[PDB]
């Protein structure tokens, strides 16, 4: 740690611009990397300290058509959501409506990261309940209830008890 921290901070601006690229091969690779970075606490802290990086992850998650890119950027928000500062950064970045949109994904890992991140925001982040409602999150959550396994159902039922 601390070495790792500064290493990340140096790379973060360029990763940001690559994540924002128009070429989806480039986006994908930069997303894999950002996801791998989010696995170590030091560099996870440098990701969460960068509004630009957080906004690029949110925007990519939401606009992408590549399954793997949606997975890795959703996974990354998931990892940030384990920290109070991560939650706040997702929230200020517009992460909530992106995450609610990923509740329509036919992909299991993505649904998974989206519902758990939303759960962590609903539990711990002031302002999250209203912003999930504003994004239509109650209906999108209710649409999943007959469509998922009993573990997703349980988490989603809990998000709903938080919101109703």
């Amino acid at each position: 740690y601390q070495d790792d921290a500064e290493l990340a901070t140096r790379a973060i601006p360029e990763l940001t611009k690559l994540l924002n690229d128009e070429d989806q091969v480039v986006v994908n690779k930069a997303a894999v990397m950002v996801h791998q970075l989010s696995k170590k606490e030091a560099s996870r802290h440098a990701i969460m300290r960068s509004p630009q990086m957080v906004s690029a992850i949110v925007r990519t998650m939401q606009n992408t058509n590549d399954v793997e890119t949606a997975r890795c950027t959703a996974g990354t928000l998931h990892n940030l959501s384990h920290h109070r500062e991560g939650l706040l950064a997702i929230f200020k970045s517009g992460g909530i409506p992106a995450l609610v949109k990923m509740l329509g994904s036919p992909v299991d890992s993505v649904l998974f990261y989206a519902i758990t991140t939303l759960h962590n925001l609903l539990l711990h982040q002031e302002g999250a309940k209203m912003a999930v409602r504003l994004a239509g999150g109650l209906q999108k959550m209710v649409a999943l209830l007959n469509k998922t396994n009993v573990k997703f159902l349980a988490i989603t039922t809990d998000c709903l008890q938080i919101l109703a």
Partner: peptide, 27 residues
């Protein structure tokens, strides 16, 4: 392949190289 123009193929290659540079720095 994706039927990129040469200008797109050049941008793809320079971006992937920088990514390899960053992957190297981050090991």
């Amino acid at each position: 392949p994706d039927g990129l123009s040469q200008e797109q193929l050049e941008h793809r290659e320079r971006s992937l190289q920088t990514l390899r540079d960053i992957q190297r720095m981050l090991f």
